[PDB]
Amino acid sequence: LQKFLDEAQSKKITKEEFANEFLKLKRQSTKYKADKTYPTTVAEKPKNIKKNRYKDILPYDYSRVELSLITSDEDSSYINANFIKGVYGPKAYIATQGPLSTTLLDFWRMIWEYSVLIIVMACMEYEMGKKKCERYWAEPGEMQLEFGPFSVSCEAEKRKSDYIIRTLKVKFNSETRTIYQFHYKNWPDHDVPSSIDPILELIWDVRCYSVPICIHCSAGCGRTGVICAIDYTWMLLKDGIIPENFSVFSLIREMRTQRPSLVQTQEQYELVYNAVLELF
C-alpha cells in the first residue's frame, strides 16, 4: 500500500520530460476527428458570449452548470462554469471564470441554487496591473453589498499568511445563508514560484470548514484546475488512494475532460505534481 511515485520521480526531472508529459495532453477534441467531442453551444449562443470573460475558454455543454433560480424574467440558464468530479461524485467541484460585473447575479444565483458553502478565489482583483476579476464579496468596515435580491454581508475575516478567510452572510429570500470565501491572493502568476506550502495549508483549511466547492480564478481553469487536482488527490490519500496507473497525468486527463484546459500550463502541471509530491 505504498505506491512509489516517490521511487519513480527521481527520474521524471525537467522540461522536454514534463513538456512531453504535458504535450501528450492534446485533449483538444482530437483522436481522429477534432469534431465537437464536447460541443460548446450554450456558451457560443447569442445572448451568452458576453457572459464569457475569455473567448477561448468555452465551457462544455455536458458539464455546464445551468441556472434555475429566476429572480427576474431576464435570467439566463448559462454561466461560464463547469462541474468537475471528485473521488466519489459528479458535483464535487465547480470551476467558473472570474465573475463579471454583468454575471455577478448569476454567480450568486448559482452559489445559492447549488447550495455552495466554501468559495475559493485564487486571484487578486488586479494582477500584473490588469484586472483579473470582479468583486462580489462585501468587505468588513462597510456593511452590505447587494447583487439583486441577494445581499452579501461580511460577518468577519481571517487575514492569514497567504490568504484571507471570508465569512459572508448572504440573504436572498427571507432566508440568509452563511458562506466562506478563501481568497488566495499570493501566487506570482503562472510560471514557477515552487513553494506550495501555503497552497496546501489553504486546501487543508478549506477542508476544515457534502455540497459543491466553488473554485475560481480569472479564466476559471488555470489556477482552479491546479487546486481541484491537489485536493482531489488530497482526498484519495487520506482514504483509499487507488493505485491504478492513476497518476497526475491520467488525473489532469480526466480533469480537462470536464473543462477545457483545466491546467493549461506546463509549470502549473509540474506544480500540481510537486504539491502532490510534498504530500509524500
Short mmCIF file of C-alpha atoms in Angstrom, two decimals:
data_model
loop_
_atom_site.label_atom_id
_atom_site.label_comp_id
_atom_site.label_asym_id
_atom_site.label_seq_id
_atom_site.Cartn_x
_atom_site.Cartn_y
_atom_site.Cartn_z
CA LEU A 1 0.00 0.00 0.00
CA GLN A 2 2.99 2.24 -0.65
CA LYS A 3 2.86 3.11 -4.32
CA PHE A 4 6.19 4.65 -5.06
CA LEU A 5 5.67 7.56 -7.36
CA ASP A 6 8.43 8.57 -4.95
CA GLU A 7 10.86 5.97 -6.19
CA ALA A 8 9.90 6.90 -9.72
CA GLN A 9 10.15 10.71 -9.60
CA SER A 10 13.95 10.78 -9.22
CA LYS A 11 13.74 10.29 -12.97
CA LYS A 12 10.93 12.41 -14.45
CA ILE A 13 13.02 15.56 -13.95
CA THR A 14 12.52 18.53 -16.31
CA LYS A 15 11.35 20.37 -19.47
CA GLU A 16 11.06 18.08 -22.52
CA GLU A 17 10.35 15.40 -19.91
CA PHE A 18 7.49 17.37 -18.30
CA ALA A 19 6.86 19.12 -21.61
CA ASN A 20 6.27 15.76 -23.30
CA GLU A 21 4.12 14.68 -20.40
CA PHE A 22 2.23 17.92 -20.97
CA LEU A 23 2.34 17.71 -24.80
CA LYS A 24 0.59 14.34 -24.65
CA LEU A 25 -2.40 16.27 -23.27
CA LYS A 26 -3.69 17.15 -26.73
CA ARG A 27 -7.12 16.63 -25.20
CA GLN A 28 -8.34 19.22 -27.70
CA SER A 29 -11.17 17.23 -29.31
CA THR A 30 -8.52 15.17 -31.03
CA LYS A 31 -8.42 11.41 -31.56
CA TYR A 32 -9.22 11.00 -35.28
CA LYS A 33 -11.65 13.90 -35.59
CA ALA A 34 -11.47 17.31 -33.89
CA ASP A 35 -15.28 17.15 -34.08
CA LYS A 36 -17.03 18.55 -31.04
CA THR A 37 -16.13 15.63 -28.78
CA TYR A 38 -17.79 18.05 -26.37
CA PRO A 39 -19.60 20.93 -28.11
CA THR A 40 -19.89 24.37 -26.51
CA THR A 41 -23.12 25.78 -27.92
CA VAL A 42 -24.87 27.45 -24.97
CA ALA A 43 -21.63 29.35 -24.42
CA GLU A 44 -21.45 30.42 -28.06
CA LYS A 45 -25.23 31.10 -28.01
CA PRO A 46 -26.42 34.67 -28.91
CA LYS A 47 -27.00 36.36 -25.55
CA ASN A 48 -24.27 34.43 -23.70
CA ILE A 49 -20.99 35.30 -25.49
CA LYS A 50 -20.96 38.41 -23.26
CA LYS A 51 -21.42 36.34 -20.09
CA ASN A 52 -18.00 34.89 -21.03
CA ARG A 53 -14.82 36.64 -19.94
CA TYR A 54 -12.18 34.94 -22.10
CA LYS A 55 -13.24 33.76 -25.54
CA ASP A 56 -11.10 30.65 -25.97
CA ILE A 57 -12.28 29.31 -22.64
CA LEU A 58 -15.64 27.86 -23.64
CA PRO A 59 -17.46 25.74 -21.04
CA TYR A 60 -18.52 22.26 -22.23
CA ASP A 61 -22.24 21.59 -22.51
CA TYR A 62 -22.31 18.08 -20.99
CA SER A 63 -20.76 19.51 -17.80
CA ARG A 64 -22.05 23.10 -17.91
CA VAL A 65 -23.72 24.05 -14.64
CA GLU A 66 -27.02 25.66 -15.60
CA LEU A 67 -29.09 28.04 -13.52
CA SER A 68 -32.66 27.65 -12.36
CA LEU A 69 -33.27 30.48 -9.88
CA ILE A 70 -35.13 33.17 -11.82
CA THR A 71 -35.01 36.28 -9.61
CA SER A 72 -36.26 38.22 -12.62
CA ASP A 73 -37.51 37.14 -16.03
CA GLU A 74 -34.23 38.27 -17.69
CA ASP A 75 -32.31 35.36 -16.11
CA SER A 76 -30.16 33.14 -18.30
CA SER A 77 -29.56 29.43 -17.58
CA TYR A 78 -25.94 29.79 -18.67
CA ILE A 79 -22.94 30.57 -16.50
CA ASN A 80 -19.36 30.01 -17.61
CA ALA A 81 -18.55 27.34 -15.04
CA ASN A 82 -18.40 23.57 -15.15
CA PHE A 83 -18.86 20.70 -12.72
CA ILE A 84 -15.66 18.74 -12.16
CA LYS A 85 -15.97 15.35 -10.44
CA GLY A 86 -14.25 14.13 -7.31
CA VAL A 87 -13.34 10.82 -5.68
CA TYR A 88 -16.99 9.74 -5.39
CA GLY A 89 -19.44 12.04 -7.12
CA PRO A 90 -20.06 14.25 -10.17
CA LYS A 91 -20.67 17.61 -8.48
CA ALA A 92 -17.68 17.73 -6.16
CA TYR A 93 -16.16 20.88 -7.59
CA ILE A 94 -17.42 23.79 -9.67
CA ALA A 95 -14.93 25.90 -11.63
CA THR A 96 -16.18 29.23 -13.04
CA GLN A 97 -14.36 32.14 -14.63
CA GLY A 98 -13.91 35.29 -12.55
CA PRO A 99 -17.37 36.81 -12.05
CA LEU A 100 -18.30 39.69 -14.31
CA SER A 101 -20.00 42.95 -13.44
CA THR A 102 -22.79 41.51 -15.58
CA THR A 103 -22.53 37.91 -14.34
CA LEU A 104 -22.46 38.88 -10.66
CA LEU A 105 -26.11 37.96 -10.25
CA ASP A 106 -25.74 34.62 -11.99
CA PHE A 107 -22.70 33.88 -9.83
CA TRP A 108 -24.63 34.26 -6.63
CA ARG A 109 -27.74 32.64 -8.17
CA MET A 110 -25.62 29.55 -8.60
CA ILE A 111 -23.98 29.72 -5.15
CA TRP A 112 -27.47 29.86 -3.83
CA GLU A 113 -29.16 27.32 -6.05
CA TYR A 114 -26.33 24.82 -5.75
CA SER A 115 -26.01 25.36 -2.06
CA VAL A 116 -22.29 26.12 -2.06
CA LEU A 117 -20.63 26.80 1.31
CA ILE A 118 -16.94 27.16 0.57
CA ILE A 119 -15.85 29.59 -2.17
CA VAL A 120 -12.22 29.65 -3.35
CA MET A 121 -10.95 32.70 -5.25
CA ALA A 122 -7.39 32.15 -6.42
CA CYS A 123 -6.67 35.65 -7.67
CA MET A 124 -6.47 39.31 -6.85
CA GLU A 125 -8.86 41.81 -8.49
CA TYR A 126 -5.81 43.03 -10.38
CA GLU A 127 -2.66 41.04 -11.09
CA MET A 128 0.28 42.39 -13.09
CA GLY A 129 -1.65 45.63 -13.34
CA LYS A 130 -4.60 44.31 -15.36
CA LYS A 131 -7.96 43.43 -13.75
CA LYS A 132 -8.44 39.67 -13.42
CA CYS A 133 -11.74 39.50 -11.54
CA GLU A 134 -14.90 41.22 -10.27
CA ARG A 135 -15.59 41.78 -6.56
CA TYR A 136 -18.74 40.10 -5.27
CA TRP A 137 -17.92 39.76 -1.62
CA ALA A 138 -18.54 42.56 0.90
CA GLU A 139 -15.53 43.69 2.92
CA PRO A 140 -15.56 44.48 6.69
CA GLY A 141 -15.66 48.08 7.81
CA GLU A 142 -18.55 48.73 5.45
CA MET A 143 -21.72 46.71 5.73
CA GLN A 144 -24.00 45.42 2.97
CA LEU A 145 -23.34 44.95 -0.73
CA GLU A 146 -26.25 43.82 -2.92
CA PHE A 147 -26.34 41.74 -6.09
CA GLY A 148 -30.07 41.70 -6.76
CA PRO A 149 -32.35 40.21 -4.15
CA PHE A 150 -29.01 38.78 -2.95
CA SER A 151 -27.48 40.75 -0.05
CA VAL A 152 -23.84 39.91 0.85
CA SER A 153 -22.77 40.82 4.37
CA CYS A 154 -19.32 40.03 5.74
CA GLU A 155 -19.57 38.74 9.32
CA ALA A 156 -15.75 38.86 9.68
CA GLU A 157 -12.42 37.80 8.08
CA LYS A 158 -9.21 35.97 8.94
CA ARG A 159 -6.31 37.85 7.35
CA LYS A 160 -3.99 34.76 7.37
CA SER A 161 -0.49 34.24 5.93
CA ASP A 162 -1.14 33.96 2.21
CA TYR A 163 -4.94 34.13 2.12
CA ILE A 164 -7.96 35.62 3.87
CA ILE A 165 -10.90 33.56 5.15
CA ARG A 166 -14.15 35.38 4.48
CA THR A 167 -17.46 34.66 6.21
CA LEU A 168 -20.28 36.17 4.19
CA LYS A 169 -23.88 36.29 5.45
CA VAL A 170 -25.89 36.19 2.21
CA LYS A 171 -29.64 36.84 2.45
CA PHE A 172 -31.73 36.03 -0.60
CA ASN A 173 -35.42 35.47 0.17
CA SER A 174 -36.44 35.99 3.77
CA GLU A 175 -33.59 33.49 4.24
CA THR A 176 -29.92 34.22 4.96
CA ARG A 177 -27.19 31.62 4.28
CA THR A 178 -23.60 31.75 5.53
CA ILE A 179 -20.65 31.46 3.08
CA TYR A 180 -16.84 31.28 3.34
CA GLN A 181 -14.58 32.83 0.72
CA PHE A 182 -10.99 31.58 0.76
CA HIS A 183 -9.26 34.45 -1.01
CA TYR A 184 -5.83 33.15 -2.07
CA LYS A 185 -4.06 36.36 -3.11
CA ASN A 186 -0.46 35.08 -3.04
CA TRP A 187 0.79 33.39 -6.25
CA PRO A 188 3.16 35.10 -8.73
CA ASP A 189 1.32 34.27 -11.96
CA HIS A 190 1.73 31.03 -13.91
CA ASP A 191 5.44 30.18 -14.08
CA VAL A 192 7.41 28.80 -11.12
CA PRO A 193 7.02 30.06 -7.53
CA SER A 194 7.57 26.43 -6.47
CA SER A 195 6.92 26.57 -2.72
CA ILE A 196 3.37 25.35 -2.38
CA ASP A 197 3.46 25.04 1.39
CA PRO A 198 0.57 27.54 1.53
CA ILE A 199 -1.36 26.07 -1.42
CA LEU A 200 -1.55 23.01 0.81
CA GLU A 201 -2.16 24.96 4.01
CA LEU A 202 -5.05 26.63 2.23
CA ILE A 203 -6.60 23.44 0.89
CA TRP A 204 -6.31 21.94 4.34
CA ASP A 205 -8.05 24.97 5.81
CA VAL A 206 -10.85 24.72 3.28
CA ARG A 207 -11.35 21.06 4.14
CA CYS A 208 -11.64 22.32 7.70
CA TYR A 209 -14.86 24.30 7.14
CA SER A 210 -21.36 17.28 1.01
CA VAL A 211 -22.14 20.25 -1.25
CA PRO A 212 -20.13 21.59 -4.24
CA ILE A 213 -16.95 23.65 -3.85
CA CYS A 214 -16.79 26.80 -5.97
CA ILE A 215 -13.17 27.10 -7.08
CA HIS A 216 -12.46 30.00 -9.42
CA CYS A 217 -9.65 32.25 -10.62
CA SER A 218 -9.67 34.54 -13.67
CA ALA A 219 -10.32 32.24 -16.63
CA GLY A 220 -11.62 29.82 -14.07
CA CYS A 221 -9.46 26.90 -15.14
CA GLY A 222 -5.77 27.79 -14.87
CA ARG A 223 -5.20 28.07 -11.16
CA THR A 224 -8.59 26.45 -10.30
CA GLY A 225 -7.67 23.30 -12.16
CA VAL A 226 -4.49 23.07 -10.06
CA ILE A 227 -6.37 23.32 -6.78
CA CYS A 228 -9.04 20.78 -7.67
CA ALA A 229 -6.42 18.15 -8.61
CA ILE A 230 -4.36 18.67 -5.47
CA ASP A 231 -7.41 18.43 -3.23
CA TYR A 232 -8.69 15.56 -5.37
CA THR A 233 -5.51 13.61 -4.61
CA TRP A 234 -5.52 15.04 -1.07
CA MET A 235 -8.82 13.13 -0.89
CA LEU A 236 -7.66 9.77 -2.30
CA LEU A 237 -4.65 9.79 0.02
CA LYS A 238 -6.37 10.06 3.41
CA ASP A 239 -8.71 7.16 2.48
CA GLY A 240 -8.05 4.67 -0.33
CA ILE A 241 -5.70 6.23 -2.89
CA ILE A 242 -6.49 3.87 -5.77
CA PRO A 243 -3.04 2.81 -7.11
CA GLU A 244 -4.17 2.12 -10.68
CA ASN A 245 -1.79 3.63 -13.22
CA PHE A 246 -3.73 6.64 -11.86
CA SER A 247 -1.12 9.37 -11.99
CA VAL A 248 -1.08 13.16 -12.14
CA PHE A 249 -1.34 12.86 -15.96
CA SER A 250 -4.28 10.44 -16.11
CA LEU A 251 -5.65 12.73 -13.34
CA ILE A 252 -5.44 16.03 -15.21
CA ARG A 253 -6.58 13.92 -18.18
CA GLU A 254 -9.99 13.31 -16.63
CA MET A 255 -9.99 16.89 -15.26
CA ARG A 256 -9.68 18.57 -18.67
CA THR A 257 -12.47 16.39 -19.97
CA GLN A 258 -14.93 18.29 -17.80
CA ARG A 259 -13.44 21.69 -18.61
CA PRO A 260 -11.08 22.66 -21.45
CA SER A 261 -7.52 23.16 -20.23
CA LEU A 262 -8.22 22.75 -16.51
CA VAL A 263 -4.47 23.01 -16.30
CA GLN A 264 -3.14 24.78 -19.37
CA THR A 265 0.46 25.39 -18.22
CA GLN A 266 3.39 23.00 -18.02
CA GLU A 267 4.57 24.94 -14.97
CA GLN A 268 1.11 24.53 -13.39
CA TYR A 269 1.35 20.86 -14.43
CA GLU A 270 4.69 20.44 -12.74
CA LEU A 271 3.05 22.38 -9.87
CA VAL A 272 0.07 20.13 -9.15
CA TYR A 273 2.67 17.39 -9.42
CA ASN A 274 5.18 18.74 -6.87
CA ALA A 275 2.40 19.52 -4.36
CA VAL A 276 1.01 16.01 -4.84
CA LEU A 277 4.65 15.19 -4.19
CA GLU A 278 5.11 17.02 -0.87
CA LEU A 279 2.06 15.11 0.32
CA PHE A 280 4.66 12.33 0.27
#
